[PDB]
């Protein structure tokens, strides 16, 4: 009775606890008499599995506290094998003796015995295999199966298996009556992330060792992609930045300010540096988006504003209605006018749970079949979360259009055309945003029928907008910014450049000769 689930350190994984508890131990709560009158057998086999660094070992270690009587036995996979002929087989069928005897004696009163194989995949590889070395690796697994299936009425045993990779294992362990339930344990959510901070940071918090300045919620918000393992790693990095301010390692000797030791305290900036040190293998790194828009949005005209409101209309549209489960749009305009950034602006402002982008850079260097595979991977993955934003960049480049033949790769084009018309599985919605610069080509391949609506983005032409951007760039002083535009008015009033080129010219002229004679010159040659 002296227990509740709150009192132990596993954060986030509450649902999994409920499922496992309901599947494993519920049947053995009641007096035995009910269950035979209920005509239901107990589950004997358990599998826990997940990626490296999820916390499973902590569960396997701690659960022995809750689960009364005495102690689950623990073994490591490779410990079982042995030198002498026949010893290895003996070893496995030596574990079951005690419970067998006790049970055989006492009938159903037997105390429940638990055994846990950590690192199961060591030796239980798929028995129907070849390589034809010494056959010990077969005998072993056969032995377990004999003791596990034809148990001869041994109904007080739960075997628990821990692994990092389910696939390796014999399918002849994955069947009813033997390892029935398989529990997947995946990366924590944001709330679980907060509990992991809570549990890791307990002690240091009580003892007045962290400055009140720190606020856990924002740290949890930032750390979008971390398993618990990394979380304690980050904690120790932050603590270390704290400790290293008194002890100056290397330089000089050990200079300990005995006084400052009492005042030692971690602070927020330490945590930021700690963040700067560690890096997850979570790997998606969708910060890609922000580096795309690193040149930024200055909103130099109304056209951008109108476009942004239209994008807002569509994101609301897909969010609200239930019959619109798929919307696609095309964004076209002159080259270098700057298109990808605008779509990125829409996407980042959207704030959906789910985003990715596809761009030739990540695609670079594979062979064709690998391209095809990658593209498929990304689409299928996108279908999971309820609401999803996905961006396709520079289609023409993905298809390898060159006008000589004209030559290009058909298969990828077909794949994309088919993919864009796929309504997702039930009760998902999707928003697909594609950009291009060579509209006529798209017209002539005649795939223009797969786009619901299209957006033009003309480049800038009026000297006033130039004045806006250049005041934003702080190119020159006020009089300078006036005189240049006055001179440009008569030098070449008709004007058509773009945006990217304008920034490039601005920088070149800024360094070299920020008078008219360079910036205006380059702008004229370009125009």
């Amino acid at each position: 009775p002296d227990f509740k689930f709150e009192d132990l350190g596993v954060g986030g994984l509450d649902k999994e606890f409920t499922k496992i508890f309901r599947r494993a131990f519920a049947s053995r709560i009641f007096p035995p008499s009910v269950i035979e009158k209920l005509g239901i057998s107990h589950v004997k086999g358990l599998l826990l599995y997940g990626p490296p660094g999820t916390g499973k070992t902590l569960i396997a270690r701690k659960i022995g506290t809750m689960l009364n009587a005495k102690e689950p036995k623990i073994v490591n996979g490779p410990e079982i094998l042995s030198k002498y002929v026949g010893s290895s087989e003996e070893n496995i069928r030596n574990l079951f003796k005690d419970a067998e005897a006790e049970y055989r004696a006492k009938g159903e009163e037997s105390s429940l015995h638990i055994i846990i194989f950590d690192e199961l995949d060591s030796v239980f590889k798929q028995r129907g295999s070849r390589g034809d070395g010494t056959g010990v690796g077969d005998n072993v697994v056969n032995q377990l199966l004999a003791k596990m299936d034809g148990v001869d009425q041994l109904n007080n045993i739960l075997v628990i298996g821990m692994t990092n990779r389910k696939d390796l294992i014999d399918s002849a362990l994955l069947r009813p009556g033997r390892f029935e339930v398989q529990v997947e344990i995946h990366l924590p959510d944001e709330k679980g992330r907060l509990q992991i901070f809570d549990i890791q940071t307990k002690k240091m918090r009580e003892n007045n060792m962290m400055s009140d300045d720190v606020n856990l919620a924002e740290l949890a918000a930032l750390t979008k992609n971390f398993s618990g393992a990394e979380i304690e790693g980050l904690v120790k990095s932050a603590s270390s930045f704290a400790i290293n301010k008194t002890v100056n390692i290397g330089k000089g000797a050990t200079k300990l300010n005995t006084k400052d030791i009492a005042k030692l305290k971690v602070t927020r900036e330490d945590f930021l540096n700690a963040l700067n040190d560690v890096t997850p293998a979570f790997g998606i790194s969708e910060e890609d988006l922000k580096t795309c828009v690193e040149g930024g949005m200055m909103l130099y005209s109304e056209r951008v504003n109108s476009i942004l409101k239209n994008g807002a209309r569509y994101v609301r549209q897909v969010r609200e209605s239930d019959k619109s489960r798929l919307v696609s749009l095309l964004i076209h305009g002159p080259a270098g006018s700057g298109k990808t950034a605008l779509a990125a602006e829409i996407a980042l402002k959207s704030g959906f749970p789910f985003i990715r982008l596809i761009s030739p850079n990540e695609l670079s260097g594979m062979s064709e079949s690998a391209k095809i595979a990658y593209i498929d991977n990304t689409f299928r993955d996108a279908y999971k979360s309820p609401l999803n934003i996905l961006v396709i960049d520079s289609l023409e480049t993905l298809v390898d259009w060159v006008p000589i033949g004209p030559r290009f790769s058909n298969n990828i084009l077909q794949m994309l055309k088919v993919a864009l018309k796929r309504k997702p599985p039930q009760d998902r919605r999707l928003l697909i945003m594609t950009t291009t610069s060579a509209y006529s080509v798209l017209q002539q391949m005649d795939i223009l029928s797969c786009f619901d609506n299209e957006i033009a983005v003309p480049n800038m032409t009026n000297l006033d907008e130039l004045n806006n951007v250049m005041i934003e760039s702080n190119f020159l002083d006020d009089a300078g910014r006036v005189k240049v535009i006055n001179e440009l008015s008569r030098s070449c009033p008709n004007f058509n450049v773009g945006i990217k080129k304008t920034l490039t010219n601005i920088e070149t002229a800024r360094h070299d000769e920020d008078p008219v004679n360079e910036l205006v010159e380059l702008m004229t040659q370009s125009a």
């Binding site: 002498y84 002929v85 034809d132 010494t134």
Partner: protein
């Protein structure tokens, strides 16, 4: 049209491991575990013959 894609077959190698006789058992097997009780006897000869020489 066509080219290469998967080929070989007749070509593979294998290493080979090895276990050992069981009787081997623990090192103590004849003239090993008996040396414990054979020593007490030999200490007996030493003594009884210490009586002899004295």
């Amino acid at each position: 049209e066509v080219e290469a894609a998967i080929s070989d077959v007749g070509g593979q190698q294998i290493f080979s491991q090895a276990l050992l006789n069981a009787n081997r058992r623990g090192e103590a097997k004849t003239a090993l575990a008996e040396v414990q009780a054979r020593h007490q006897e030999l200490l007996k000869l030493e003594k009884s013959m210490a009586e002899l020489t004295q």
